[PDB]
Amino acid sequence: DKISHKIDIPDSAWTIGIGEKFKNAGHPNVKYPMIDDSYVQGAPLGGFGAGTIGRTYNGGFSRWHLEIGKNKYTTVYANQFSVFQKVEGNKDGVAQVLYAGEPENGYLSSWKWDYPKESGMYYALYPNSWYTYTNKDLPVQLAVKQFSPIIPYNYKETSYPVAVFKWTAYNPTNKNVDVSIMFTWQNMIGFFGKQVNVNSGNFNKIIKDKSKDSEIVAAVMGNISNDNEEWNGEYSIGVKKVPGVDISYKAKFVTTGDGSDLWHEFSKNGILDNKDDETPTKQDGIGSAIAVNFKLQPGQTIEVPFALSWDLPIMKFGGGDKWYKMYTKYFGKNGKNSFAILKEALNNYQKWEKMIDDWQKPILSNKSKPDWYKTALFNELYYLADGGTAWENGKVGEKRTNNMFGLLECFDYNYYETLDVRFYGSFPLVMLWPDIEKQVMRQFADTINVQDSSEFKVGSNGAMAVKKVQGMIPHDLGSSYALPWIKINAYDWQNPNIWKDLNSKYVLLVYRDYVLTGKTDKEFLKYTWKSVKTALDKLKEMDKDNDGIPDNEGIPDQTYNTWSMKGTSAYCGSLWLAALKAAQEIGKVLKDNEAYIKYNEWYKIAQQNFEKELWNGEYYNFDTESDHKDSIMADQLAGQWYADILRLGDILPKDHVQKALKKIYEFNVMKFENGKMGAVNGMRPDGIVDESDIQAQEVWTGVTYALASFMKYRGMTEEAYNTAYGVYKMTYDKSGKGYWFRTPEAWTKDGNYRASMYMRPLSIWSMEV
């Protein structure tokens, strides 16, 4: 490896060998069908709300999130980079697709597949990833840096459906070598959203944009239809000329054939035919190719940028609604703008690289933090783009000031903005994209007094319930299978209108968003204040026994949706206490004296009773009425965790909080698989895991990262990082279970998982507060 020195990969990048087999991989541990796309994954490309594309460490474009809200894992084999090399003096060169695999059927059989093992590495530090190619049959060593411009405090480039591929080529040998790099791409119009004739009308055109000191050559892969539908739009690939390189292209090769129309050209001398052909296809799949060819002298380096864009302006959800995607604000809505997007990327990628470096640098440069922590911190952010992210710029045929936003819980449970989970998962948004965060919270505020008396069948018990009760915060803002932002509470397995954590978490999120954006946004507090008061007042009505605390009902009525709490729980009770303290503080800011007094009174009573009912001398009991009420819950003091972040002070005594956290580390971490796998949710006082429900026996990745942040704030530095390390290890390390770029909600002691690609572990960003 002589190419790594010519590029700048951070030491904290996650690494794996190209073509590496992973032996230890985990699988779903539930009885029902669950997504398992394997460990062959990578950092995604694509902006927020753009649709994303997962290019794996093997080189394939395989995890397709272009249909917003859907996860489709299939390798589109025509989508590749390939290389040709010929040493000056040899009669023949060699050509190789840079993919560690081959197609399953006979399409593209002419291409040179099966990039060999032990011949290159993949690196990732989201939003960047890299591949290096160090192959005994490729005298010129190559690397590529690939990324999309995901930039904190930037709502423009961050939305773009674009990727850059910045290639570096170096000749360490003593002979001249002719080199070509070729990008192939299938015209994927009709890959989704088209019910018949999936390739019909697809056609490819070549754009040559020549001006002074700029030449861009691109293929635009579109359809003859000017219809405005979810399926229609354009893909583009292309390259920017640099000194010493020539560009060639092929506008149309058949992807549903043996590929030799293209490959006979590329494998000869790495130069394509420059054949334009705008003939639309009927049944055949078609694709385009863009190549560069150059001669490298001994010791010479060259850099050349390629790019990929996709202009698919309309997202459709299963309930029938069609919306424009965010990026259309910047490029238009007609679906004929892929070249414009590509050109912007090819002309500005160096600036974008520096913007990414500028935001990553303060963390990367902090030599007090271990590299493993940085690996997880940055790479967990993959989910902000890969979580079915929806970000609208108008309903098709409808303009508003704001752009509604939603992130999925996960794909197995297809619910946008599950608030009980976003309590943990939304940290990166408040810290790095606060205008999105505040928009989402205003969406929730607007739902508070919505009443929908239509009934639904509650899946767990068969009872009928009102869809949405006035004064109750919704569990979620809909499903991609139905009507995001329009039909809320798509979750129907239980009734969200009786949950005991939604209303408190809502208030805590509101106050969090004020505090972590500088305690200056009074307008945000004003917008949300009525909903905050309503939320707390409604929750107070669920106190059955007049102890001042809402009662859990002995069935699941909070985020641990199969683990029943009864009476006063540490979890919901502590959240309630913190939410009351937050509302007091908002009351002071807004000069609402009567609210301040009321919530102060409720707080003092509830605090006294919480302590009496639950403090046992060592920790806070799980609850007051369950069979295993004395279990040690990892998340028992979630309200105090948020109170620390919100600078609300001690809601419980410092000594008792310290004792409880030490107990949790000693038991839930250190007595669970030697503290190498995170914090198990429930442990009995005898040091055996609580077996009352599956969720008690699970480590929740997002709960564990949040607990690590709580320990860190309380000065338990070693315990904090040791706790978080188990989650990092399981996700990323060779000794783990292979969950990189698909961090699950949970695993059990065997390492097997539930719900890959999960919102909650974004909570690792609470460790940066």
Ligand X SMILES: O=[N+]([O-])c1ccc(O[C@@H]2O[C@H](CO)[C@@H](O)[C@H](O)[C@H]2F)c([N+](=O)[O-])c1
Ligand Y SMILES: OC[C@H]1O[C@H](O)[C@H](F)[C@@H](O)[C@@H]1O
**Binding site members for Ca(2+):** 543, 545, 547, 549, 551
Q: Is the bond preceding residue 761 a cis peptide, omega within 30 degrees?
A: no
User: Rounded to an integer, what distance in angstroms lies between the CA atom of residue 230 and that of residue 480?
Assistant: 14
Q: Which of ligand Y, ligand X, Ca ion, none does residue 485 bind to, with CB < 5 to 8 Å depending on kind?
A: ligand X
Say whether residue 545 binds Ca ion (CB under 5 A).
yes
Which listed residue (208, 264, 612, 654) binds ligand X by CB under 6 A? Answer: 264
Distance of alpha carbon 6 from alpha carbon 302, whole angstroms? 10
Contact 584, 576 (CB under 8 A): no
Q: Tell me the sheet residues that pair with 124.
A: 14, 129
Out of ligand Y, Ca ion, ligand X, none, which partner does residue 559 contact, by CB within 5 to 8 A per kind?
ligand Y
**CB-nearer residue toward ligand Y: 524 or 705:** 705
- Fill in the per-residue mask, 667 to 696: x = in contact with ligand Y (CB under 6 A), - = not in contact: ------------------------------
Sheet holding 80-87, edge to edge: 94-97, 80-87, 177-186, 286-296, 245-254
Distance CA(468)–CA(462), nearest Å, equals 17
**98 near 82, Cβ under 8 Å?**
yes
* Of the residues 57, 235, 491, 571, which one makes contact with ligand Y according to CB under 6 A: 491
Look at residue 547 and give the partner it binds from Ca ion, ligand X, ligand Y, none, a contact being a CB closer than 5 to 8 Å depending on partner kind.
Ca ion
The interface region with ligand Y, picked from 206-214, 243-251, 376-384, 409-417 by CB under 6 A, is 409-417
CA within 13 Å, CB half, 440: 30
Residue 488 CB, shortest distance to ligand X, in Å, is 4
Residue 747 within binding range of ligand Y, rule CB under 6 A:
no
Please tell me what DSSP assigns to residue 686: T
Q: Which stretch binds ligand X (CB under 6 A): 251-259, 334-342, 352-360, 455-463?
A: 251-259
Among 185, 235, 411, 415, binds ligand Y (CB under 6 A): 415
- Residue with smaller CB distance to ligand Y, 157 or 635: 635
Q: Distance between CA 512 and CA 615 in Å, rounded?
A: 27
CA 480 to chain centre: 16
Find the binder of ligand X among 257, 318, 332, 554 (CB under 6 A): 257
Q: Is 735 exposed, middle or buried (0-12, 13-18, 19+ CB in 10 A)?
A: exposed
Tell the smallest beta-carbon distance from residue 559 to ligand Y (Å). Answer: 4
Could you say which of 254, 342, 390, 507 contacts ligand X (CB under 6 A)?
A: 254
Distance CA 198, CA 565 (A): 51
By CB under 6 A, what part of segment 369-428 binds ligand X?
404
Residues 6 or more apart whose Cβ sits within 8 Å of residue 520: none
Nearer to ligand X, 216 or 510 (CB): 510
Show contacts with ligand X in window 419-478 (CB under 6 A): 443, 446-447, 450, 477
The only residue of 473, 745, 753, 757 in contact with ligand Y, by rule CB under 6 A = 745
256 within 8 A of 109, measured Cβ to Cβ: no
| Cβ proximity to Ca ion, 549 vs 716, nearer residue | 549
Residue 450 contact partner, candidates ligand X, Ca ion, ligand Y, none, CB within 5 to 8 A by sort of partner = ligand X
Number of residues in contact with Ca ion under rule CB under 5 A: 5
Among the listed residues 559, 569, 574, 709, the single contact to ligand Y using CB under 6 A: 559
Q: Are 406 and 477 in contact (CB under 8 A)?
A: yes
Amino acid occupying residue 637:
L
Region for 591 from its dihedrals, namely left if φ exceeds 0, alpha if ψ lies in -120 to 50, beta otherwise: left
* Identified binder of ligand X from the candidate list 260, 348, 600, 722, rule CB under 6 A: 260
Say whether residue 547 binds Ca ion (CB under 5 A).
yes
Closest residue to bound ligand Y by CB? 559
- Which residue's CB is nearer to ligand X, number 54 or number 270? 270
Report yes or no: 488 and 477 within 8 Å, Cβ to Cβ. Answer: yes
d(CA 36, CA 518): 41
Give me the count of residues in the chain. 769
Options 316-324, 413-421, 453-461, 509-517: segment touching ligand Y (CB under 6 A)? 413-421
- Which regions of 102-233 does DSSP assign to beta strands (E)? 120-125, 128-133, 141-147, 162-170, 177-186, 202-211, 214-223
Closest to ligand X by CB, 479 vs 624, is 479
CA distance 384 to 101: 29
Nearest distance from residue 616's CB to ligand X, in Å?
A: 41
Query: By the 8 A CB rule, do 740 and 379 touch?
Result: yes
Annotated binding-site members: 543, 545, 547, 549, 551
- Please identify, using beta-carbon distances, which residue of 411 and 576 lies nearer to Ca ion: 576
* 740/727 Cα distance (integer angstroms): 11
- The listed partner (ligand Y, Ca ion, ligand X, none) that binds 264, CB under 5 to 8 Å by sort, is ligand X
Could you say whether residue 557 binds Ca ion (CB under 5 A)? no
Encoded tokens for 373: 């922590």
Interface size with ligand Y, residues (CB under 6 A): 11
Two structure tokens written together for 468: 């949405």
Given 67, 321, 513, 551, the residue binding Ca ion (CB under 5 A): 551
With contacts defined by CB under 6 A, name the span among 2-10, 152-160, 418-426, 686-694 that binds ligand Y: 418-426
- Residue choice 375, 479, 561, 668 for contact with ligand Y (CB under 6 A): 561
3-class secondary-structure state, position 449: coil
Distance CA 419, CA 659 (A): 30
**Contact status, residue 473 vs residue 506, Cβ threshold 8 Å:** yes
**Number of residues near ligand X (by CB under 6 A):** 15
| Apex 56 CA angle, 273 and 380, nearest 5 | 140
Q: Which is nearer to Ca ion, 549 or 580 (CB)?
A: 549
Please choose which of ligand X, Ca ion, ligand Y, none residue 254 contacts, taking the beta carbon within 5 to 8 angstroms, the exact cut-off set by kind. Answer: ligand X
> Closest distance between ligand Y and the C-beta of residue 670, in Å?
24
* Interatomic CA distance for residues 210 and 111, integer angstroms: 32
Query: At residue 93, what is the residue type?
Result: G
Cβ–Cβ < 8 Å for 199, 344 = no
Q: Classify residue 380 by burial, with Cβ atoms within 10 Å: 0-12, 13-18, 19+.
A: buried
**What is the pattern of x (binds ligand Y, CB under 6 A) and - over residues 54-73?**
--------------------
332 interacts with ligand X by CB under 6 A: no
Q: Which does 545 bind (CB under 5 to 8 A by kind): Ca ion, ligand Y, ligand X, none?
A: Ca ion
Question: How far apart, in whole angstroms, are the C-alpha atoms of residue 156 and residue 179?
Answer: 36
Helix locations, 365-472, DSSP H: 371-379, 382-386, 419-425, 427-432, 434-447
Nearer to ligand X, 405 or 610 (CB): 405
Give the tokens for residue 374.
């940085």
Placement of tokens 């641990």 in the chain = 560
Residue with Cβ nearer ligand X (427 or 485): 485
261 interacts with ligand X by CB under 6 A: yes
Q: Does 409 bind ligand Y (CB under 6 A)?
A: yes
Site string for ligand X, 475-514 (x = CB under 6 A): --x-------xx-x--------------------------
Chain positions contacting Ca ion, by CB under 5 A: 543, 545, 547, 549, 551
**Contact footprint for ligand X (CB under 6 A):** 254, 257-258, 260-261, 264, 404, 443, 446-447, 450, 477, 485-486, 488
Residues that bind ligand Y (CB under 6 A): 409, 413, 415, 418, 420-421, 491, 559, 561, 745, 755
